[PDB]
Amino acid sequence: CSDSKAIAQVGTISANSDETVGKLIAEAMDKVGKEGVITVEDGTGLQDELDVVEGMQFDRGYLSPYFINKPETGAVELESPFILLADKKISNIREMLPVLEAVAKAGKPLLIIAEDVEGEALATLVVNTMRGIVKVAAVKAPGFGDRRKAMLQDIATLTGGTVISEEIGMELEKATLEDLGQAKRVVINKDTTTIIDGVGEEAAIQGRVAQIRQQIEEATSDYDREKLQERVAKLAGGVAVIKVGAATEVEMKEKKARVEDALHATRAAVEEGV
Amino acid sequence: AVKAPGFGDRRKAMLQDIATLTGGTVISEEIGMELEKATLEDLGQAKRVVINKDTTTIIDGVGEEAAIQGRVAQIRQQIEEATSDYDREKLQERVAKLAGGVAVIKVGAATEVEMKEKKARVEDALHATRAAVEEGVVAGGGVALIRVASKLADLRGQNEDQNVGIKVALRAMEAPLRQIVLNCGEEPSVVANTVKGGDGNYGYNAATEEYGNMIDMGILDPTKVTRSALQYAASVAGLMITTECMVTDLP
Amino acid sequence: NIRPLHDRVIVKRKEVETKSAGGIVLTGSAAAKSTRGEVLAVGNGRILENGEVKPLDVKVGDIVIFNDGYGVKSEKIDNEEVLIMSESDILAIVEA
Amino acid sequence: MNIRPLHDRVIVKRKEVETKSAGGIVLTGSAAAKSTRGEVLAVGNGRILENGEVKPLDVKVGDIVIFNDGYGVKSEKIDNEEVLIMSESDILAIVEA
Numbered sequence: 001c002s003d004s005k006a007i008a009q010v011g012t013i014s015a016n017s018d019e020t021v022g023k024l025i026a027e028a029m030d031k032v033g034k035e036g037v038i039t040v041e042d043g044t045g046l047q048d049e050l051d052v053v054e055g056m057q058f059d060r061g062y063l064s065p066y067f068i069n070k071p072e073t074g075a076v077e078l079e080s081p082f083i084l085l086a087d088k089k090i091s092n093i094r095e096m097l098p099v100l101e102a103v104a105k106a107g108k109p110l111l112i113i114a115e116d117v118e119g120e121a122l123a124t125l126v127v128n129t130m131r132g133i134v135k136v137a138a139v140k141a142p143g144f145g146d147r148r149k150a151m152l153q154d155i156a157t158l159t160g161g162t163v164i165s166e167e168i169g170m171e172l173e174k175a176t177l178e179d180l181g182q183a184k185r186v187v188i189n190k191d192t193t194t195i196i197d198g199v200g201e202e203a204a205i206q207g208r209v210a211q212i213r214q215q216i217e218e219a220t221s222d223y224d225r226e227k228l229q230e231r232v233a234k235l236a237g238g239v240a241v242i243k244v245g246a247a248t249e250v251e252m253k254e255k256k257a258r259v260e261d262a263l264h265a266t267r268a269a270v271e272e273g274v
Numbered sequence: 275a276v277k278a279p280g281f282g283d284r285r286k287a288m289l290q291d292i293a294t295l296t297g298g299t300v301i302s303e304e305i306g307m308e309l310e311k312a313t314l315e316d317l318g319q320a321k322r323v324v325i326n327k328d329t330t331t332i333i334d335g336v337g338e339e340a341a342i343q344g345r346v347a348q349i350r351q352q353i354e355e356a357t358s359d360y361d362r363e364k365l366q367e368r369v370a371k372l373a374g375g376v377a378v379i380k381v382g383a384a385t386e387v388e389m390k391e392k393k394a395r396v397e398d399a400l401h402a403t404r405a406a407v408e409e410g411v412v413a414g415g416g417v418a419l420i421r422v423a424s425k426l427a428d429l430r431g432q433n434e435d436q437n438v439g440i441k442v443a444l445r446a447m448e449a450p451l452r453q454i455v456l457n458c459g460e461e462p463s464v465v466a467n468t469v470k471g472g473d474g475n476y477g478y479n480a481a482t483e484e485y486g487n488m489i490d491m492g493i494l495d496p497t498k499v500t501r502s503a504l505q506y507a508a509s510v511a512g513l514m515i516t517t518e519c520m521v522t523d524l525p
Numbered sequence: 526n527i528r529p530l531h532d533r534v535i536v537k538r539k540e541v542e543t544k545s546a547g548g549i550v551l552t553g554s555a556a557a558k559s560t561r562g563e564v565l566a567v568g569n570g571r572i573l574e575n576g577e578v579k580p581l582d583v584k585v586g587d588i589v590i591f592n593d594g595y596g597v598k599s600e601k602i603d604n605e606e607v608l609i610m611s612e613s614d615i616l617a618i619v620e621a
Numbered sequence: 622m623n624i625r626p627l628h629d630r631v632i633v634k635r636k637e638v639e640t641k642s643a644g645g646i647v648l649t650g651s652a653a654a655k656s657t658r659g660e661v662l663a664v665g666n667g668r669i670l671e672n673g674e675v676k677p678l679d680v681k682v683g684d685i686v687i688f689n690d691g692y693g694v695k696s697e698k699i700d701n702e703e704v705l706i707m708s709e710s711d712i713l714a715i716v717e718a
């Protein structure tokens with residue numbers, strides 16, 4: 001089962017003769033491929049919806065609301081920012097000069113991804129965007145400790161930065177202006193943080209992709225493949241999410257059930273044929 | 275000196291509503307400022323303020339119309355939420371105070387049980403007028419549904435069985451009107467006929483027990499409530515007639 | 526003006542909580558207040574054993590670094606906030 | 622903009638934690654290092670005891686010194702690098718070779 005015509009059809013069959021469900025899955029599978037992830041959520045309006053997010057997008061919010069830039073709706077857009085992650089919580093480490101001044105010497109807007117930010121470090125951060133020395137914003141990292149740190153180094157190679165660890169032979173006060181990665185632009189909201197394009201070699205990315213391929217199977221079969229493919233889609237290609245619409249709450253349970261059924265079937269139909 | 279509006283986040287959000295209105299700056303312990311370091315620019319200004327035992331009022335405070343409209347535009351994103359009800363009550367409350375004004379209706383009654391009846395009839399009327407305003411109105415007496423049913427008569431489906439589903443709906447759109455008449459203890463059969471014979475807004479007035487123009491007689495259904503009633507019932511009833519089995523716990 | 530006695534000097538605090546001097550460093554949240562000062566006026570000297578009058582090594586109008594204990598007391602003179610301290614509380618005298 | 626320490630007190634610039642030269646070459650990190658070494662800038666006049674006036678501090682300038690970091694040591698910012706100030710009593714040994 002290959003062509004998107006055939007895919008939409010096997011999708012439609014599992015959907016109990018709903019053509020919309022099949023063609024929509026086909027659209028997602030056509031855009032993000034075999035490996036793109038597709039999710040089903042309860043709906044707002046009465047209509048089915050297919051959203052496509054391309055490039056790197058992960059789930060976390062900005063810790064301080066005052067960082068908002070150009071864009072309304074609390075949108076923060078930063079041009080060519082720099083990202084570094086230390087694994088640790090930053091309150092007392094507020095000194096961190098030599099590194100900031102280096103960034104101060106650069107005169108660029110920063111995008112900051114850390115394990116977490118204490119209110120103490122936050123206050124002086126507010127002062128920087130108001131004062132104008134450097135415009136800077138900071139948002140929290142996506143996951144749990146082991147899972148996040150594994151997907152953090154993945155982000156480092158994307159923007160060409162190097163991960164600094166306090167759990168490693170590297171220090172919070174020690175960083176260089178060159179250690180940071182770059183991106184074309186970044187947009188941050190209450191829920192999601194986004195990087196459009198980072199600057200990195202085609203070599204490091206798929207080199208990193210070839211190494212994770214051995215990690216795809218292992219002993220673990222299905223359960224880490226889920227977050228791993230979750231990670232994989234985010235890093236190179238893109239992820240797709242389908243918001244399933246319904247009129248009433250009881251119909252939502254029926255609509256969603258038919259949608260997940262058809263989804264698994266296309267995957268099965270895709271890999272093993274029909 | 276007066277206390278802040280509410281418990282946290284109710285209070286803190288309404289300072290920024292209040293702060294931008296009077297053009298002052300909110301002093302927070304959560305940012306790089308503190309109370310002992312403050313400027314006269316951190317202060318807001320107003321023409322007059324009145325405070326009584328229970329109330330505080332600010333008469334025409336001075337802040338840009340640009341900054342004020344900025345806070346309302348930010349609440350537009352706040353208008354659409356997952357909180358549904360009570361979220362809408364307290365959210366517009368902040369907005370109304372900042373731009374418009376507030377209205378409160380006090381329902382009177384002799385006894386507490388009549389109070390529950392009067393206030394309930396008032397809440398229905400409030401939602402209805404609000405809904406009527408935004409989404410428009412159609413002829414009451416359920417005559418809208420009985421009229422749209424007349425317009426859809428030539429409609430057909432994919433198969434013969436599907437046709438019945440279509441016809442079942444139109445017959446069922448008669449129900450509301452036919453029910454109102456029955457509550458008057460009058461022949462529903464006769465009234466349905468005499469209304470279906472005619473067109474447009476011609477309908478039955480149940481209170482005056484005489485026919486006439488629904489719109490001219492001031493009998494109005496907010497279109498939203500009529501649209502909603504039809505949609506929701508069809509969704510669940512459509513699913514409901516599909517039942518071939520039922521599972522439950524034992525007595 | 527007033528004159529402190531013995532070994533005690535009366536100093537006017539320099540700006541508080543703003544670290545804005547040194548490096549490229551900007552202003553932070555956590556506060557360290559007034560580690561330096563311009564003084565005002567000084568005492569005659571401290572007696573030691575019998576030391577009688579030994580002139581204090583710090584002259585007047587000099588800007589100095591200090592460690593603030595309770596030995597220094599916060600007073601308000603001439604609508605100005607001032608610190609009274611013992612000369613032993615002065616660490617170093619900075620000069621441009 | 623040099624800075625002058627008062628009597629008995631010495632001002633010295635710290636020497637950064639050495640990547641371990643002991644067990645050469647095995648390096649320690651990343652953590653603070655107890656100071657068996659240190660540099661200096663200026664020196665106070667001396668300490669007075671019972672008219673004993675000022676005994677010149679036995680430490681000269683440019684001398685490499687070992688010290689214990691106690692409550693007595695303060696951290697200050699001078700142009701560029703920040704340096705620390707202390708009493709001669711807190712200085713233990715001067716390294717010479």
Ligand SMILES: Nc1ncnc2c1ncn2[C@@H]1O[C@H](COP(=O)(O)OP(=O)(O)O)[C@@H](O)[C@H]1O
Pocket residue numbers: 413414415416417454478479480481482493494495
């Ligand atoms: N005087 C009247 N004459 C005819 N129909 C009326 C009159 N007053 C109300 N109606 C109709 O009866 C319905 C009243 O609904 P009501 O019982 O108040 O709440 P709900 O809309 O939930 O049924 C409306 O659809 C309206 O068209």
Ligand SMILES: [Mg+2]
Pocket residue numbers: 013014015016261
């Ligand atoms: Mg099936």
